[PDB]
Symmetry: D2
Subunit: 348 residues, 4 copies
């Protein structure tokens, strides 16, 4: 009944450093949101407007972008008329983030993942950096939306959104820990290949990731099960696992085997997941009842799809859970989500 303006949440100015699989999935995820607090104003692409526009528009995994993608001039593209600056520097110290008034950098290079490296963006003028990967520094806080994003504070200048596998695992591990308690467990992710692997046998520090990715099942170490304890500290020292990279281009599946404290059975485990999916983890955790295969989970927005018919309990307290995740697109929706959290908590 009073004289007032309308509430304005402020949009933060975002730059994407590294316009790779995750950088380009992030842009399409953002562009498809009905409402956003993010204004993407800059992209660092070594190939300039030609490469940025082409690889944004045409995608072997996602299909052709329905949006109108145009080259505006020699340093701008537009997406449905919204212009975005293209910069091209390998050294973040050289990026114009002070001049462009950048609030948040999405670090999707896989290169600047510790405080010194990501901090170069802040030295260059940005206020905050969100690393799309596990941090290389123990003191960089890590967040998984659906698990611990309420512990985010505006006063963290550098943050990590963890790995795709940790974003799959941690929501349903949180449910297991809440309902049944975890003693210890192991995980194997059967994971699509990524650009870190080689197309044909070739140079790599990892002699297994050196091997032809579309021809092989390729074991590789993973920090993702240990990393769950960065977001669920009660799980410190309780989980470990491995990865098997296989000849698919996206979608992965986690197989977790945990010993729980409370004796249970498969229907009760699934009921705990369904309760979470319908409530506090809606949009992050899904329980799938149809008999599907990996490609059915392409471009799904949730972090975790429990394959309900595969849930198994052995000897009362050994619980096996199988969960699908689109390691590109679902993970990128979580990057958008965590960037939106930083916008919501931005301090005046």
């Amino acid at each position: 009944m009073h004289h007032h303006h309308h509430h304005m949440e402020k949009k933060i100015r975002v730059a994407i450093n590294g316009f790779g699989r995750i950088g380009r999935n992030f842009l399409r995820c953002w562009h498809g949101r009905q409402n956003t607090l993010l204004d993407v104003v800059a992209i660092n692409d070594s190939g300039g407007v030609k490469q940025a526009s082409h690889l944004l528009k045409y995608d072997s995994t996602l299909g052709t972008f329905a949006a109108d993608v145009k080259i505006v001039d020699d340093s701008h593209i537009s997406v449905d008329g919204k212009q975005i600056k293209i910069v091209s520097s390998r050294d973040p110290l050289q990026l114009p983030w002070k001049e462009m008034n950048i609030d948040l950098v999405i670090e999707g290079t896989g290169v600047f993942i510790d405080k010194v490296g990501a901090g170069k963006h802040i030295q260059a003028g940005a206020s905050k950096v969100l690393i799309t990967a596990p941090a290389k520094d123990k003191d960089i806080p890590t967040f998984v939306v659906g698990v611990n994003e309420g512990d985010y504070k505006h006063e963290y200048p550098i943050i990590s959104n963890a790995s795709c596998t940790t974003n799959c695992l941690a929501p349903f591990v949180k449910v297991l820990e809440q309902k049944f308690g975890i003693v210890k467990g192991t995980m194997t992710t059967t994971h699509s290949y990524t650009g870190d692997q080689r197309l044909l046998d070739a140079s790599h520090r990892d002699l297994r990731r050196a091997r032809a990715a579309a021809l092989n099942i390729v074991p590789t170490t993973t920090g993702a099960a240990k990393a769950v304890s960065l977001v669920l500290p009660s799980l410190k020292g309780k989980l470990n696992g491995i990865a098997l990279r296989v000849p698919t281009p996206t979608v992965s599946v986690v197989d977790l085997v945990v010993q729980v404290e409370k004796k249970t059975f498969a229907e009760e485990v699934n009921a705990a997941f369904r309760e979470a999916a319908n409530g506090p983890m809606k949009g992050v955790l899904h329980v799938e009842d149809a008999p599907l295969v990996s490609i059915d989970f392409k471009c799904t927005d949730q972090s975790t799809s429990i394959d309900a018919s595969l849930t198994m309990v052995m000897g009362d307290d050994m619980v096996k859970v199988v969960a699908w995740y689109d390691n590109e697109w679902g993970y990128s929706q979580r990057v958008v989500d965590l960037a939106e959290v930083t916008a919501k908590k931005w301090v005046a």
Copy 2:
């Protein structure tokens, strides 16, 4: 002294079996007949040329309308969908290798004996429970000549049972679960199409495809102390051969990875030599193609959590390694042959 063998079902396992047999230094098996509905043209061609085994180095020829020859040795080719119609009495067949995936129960496999064979070796789990099952390196000393129909189990049970036997002896298994990440097989569809299993209906080279497995339960057929202790699942993936078992077990004796691996090495160097291998190099699936062992423990992947949760990862060539076990089990029947 040698026994006369017919192969029924000249598919992936039937053809791997012939090439495995042909490469043996010494054998008590005389392969004399192959039932292939494509006749000499198809049998000769797919024996010689193989997308995963490569070209057979033997000279493969079409002799006449019902014989091929392999390095000069003639094999009769027959073509009947009905085993009752096969000439096994005429040809004095001792042993039928059942590689069709169809005649896997006691009535079905028994048709070969009705047609005149003496014994049938099913290259698969049997459907009914009174057909004895054997895994070479685990319980083949329990085979008896009086068994007219026997099973060599599945590829996954042949990989699992040898190293589960070691774990049970050394540490004691309380319970466990397994996943096999498994190459696609001919039961799955190339593009989405009719299948009684709606996941196996889906394009095999495009997908990770979950499917049931009987292999964790089947271990208890050859290792009775494992009754009720294991369960698991398969994930079929877009590779054409070589598979990998990931087993997680709770054990009685608290342990650590090096000690688990040491138990496997003792077995690989002794009583399971040739069946169980421990691999120390950092390899990938294709490196285990055409390996003769049933199981290759990937040593650097062994993990122990909380003292008594043991994770073991083991590779197996589900075509070639399994078919070497089929040859081995058939050789056992020859050694114990009486009548």
Copy 3:
């Protein structure tokens, strides 16, 4: 200025026999049309409502159907509330087409492709059969939309929509013949694998199609270049070719080399194609100027996409043209189109 009703074009009652790749692509193509003269009332699926609904909804090539797919009862599914009968007979003589008042059968089995076999549907009660494949009988008329569908007559009870490759070739061959004249030519299609090939080396009358399809380049004979003369009779005896099946699941590309009568150059050839694309072959023939790869042509509605930068002319009169086609989806749009022609010409 007079008392009148509105014009009513009649919808023909359609049954799909063989709910395979082409049968299911046909249903989705039809369902996505803004306006149609086709009412799909029956599907013959050996697996009943469970298999028909599941494989309609979930598709490894097309992705998940956005439409609401439900099992209504033991012999009906619904798509966005529209109910469709599921029948399951291997012998078309046994299908209930008289009882269901079927106008047109889409024959997508690959089995009933000559007059006796397709004619079993007419004996069963249908009025017309459209074979989604080359006919096995020389006297069954063949049509390619964009080429000769004006020669269709209601009085043909059995018709063929030719093969996917002939639907790619014939529109742009028609342009070449019109503008430059064809002396003779050869073609190779580099073609996705199909369900006729084997997953691992296994039984087949064709010893090359016996071989593992996702591991190999697989030569196979093709009638598709000769078949162009069924729709363009001036080309009788002038074309032949081969197929190479490769490890992709859909989209194919035709490489045609023709000797022409009129001396020409690449830009002039492409200009003839662009004139056709913009005019009489709009929606059937497309000229693509971007540097794309096979998966960019997935789910494209045209029959033919000329890769303009690959057009080459050697020695004045040897013309090489490269054209992309989605052998499942584009072909199925042409099946819908040819069925719509039969509806338009239906005689009162």
Copy 4:
């Protein structure tokens, strides 16, 4: 009598070259040095284990921090991105096999001679026109010891030139076009990523990928009568090795398929024995893996339209068959070695 060889670039061609050389009965080549930036660990491992060639049967060992051994024969491993820094004077290197794809022009390849080598053989088309190009079976009799830098052309030109030589001799080529349906190579990306060529940027195992080829024009370097007569394109497809050339030519002499094939058989049985093969069996790409010839005409695919339009389809293992030609051309330099 033997010449001392260094391999610069231990990639697919560098490693195929070593295995091809090692399998020769007789050789005038002594491979003494390999430049691999991953050192002995990487060079030994990727030489032993290979996703398309399979495991090397030779004993491969790490001797010390700068030597491996292959069946006991030691090879020095060096690691410099800059050829000027390589120890070729110290090691008395005669011939460098340039397998990097980088030092393919006269300045770049010349750095190995500046560093002390006498001769460089580029395993690729050269970038500038005064580097002589040779295809074994076509023009290697034109090689001269006085040429310090030579090219062995591309895999596609090695497949094309031998049978184009036969067509030109027997029928006369007026003009023609070619497409190669070619396995992916390491220049392409695994998933969509940066590339100067926006089609080679795209996921290689998911796509048919058009790309330019110099091979049809390059035939005129080794066969001057072909100047200006051919053009063509490549389609990269999701297979890891083996490729196929489809050539369509207008010829002078009217002919028919059996006569074209007969010309190829005459050449395969005579002056191109070992380089050109004519295949009569109905095979697929994997059957031509690890074949030693440069070209396998698929006889049943030869087609003649309108009397003078000839279509020929020829298979080639773009890794192994090409590397056997690299070995052959290096052996020619050894036979003609003076100083």
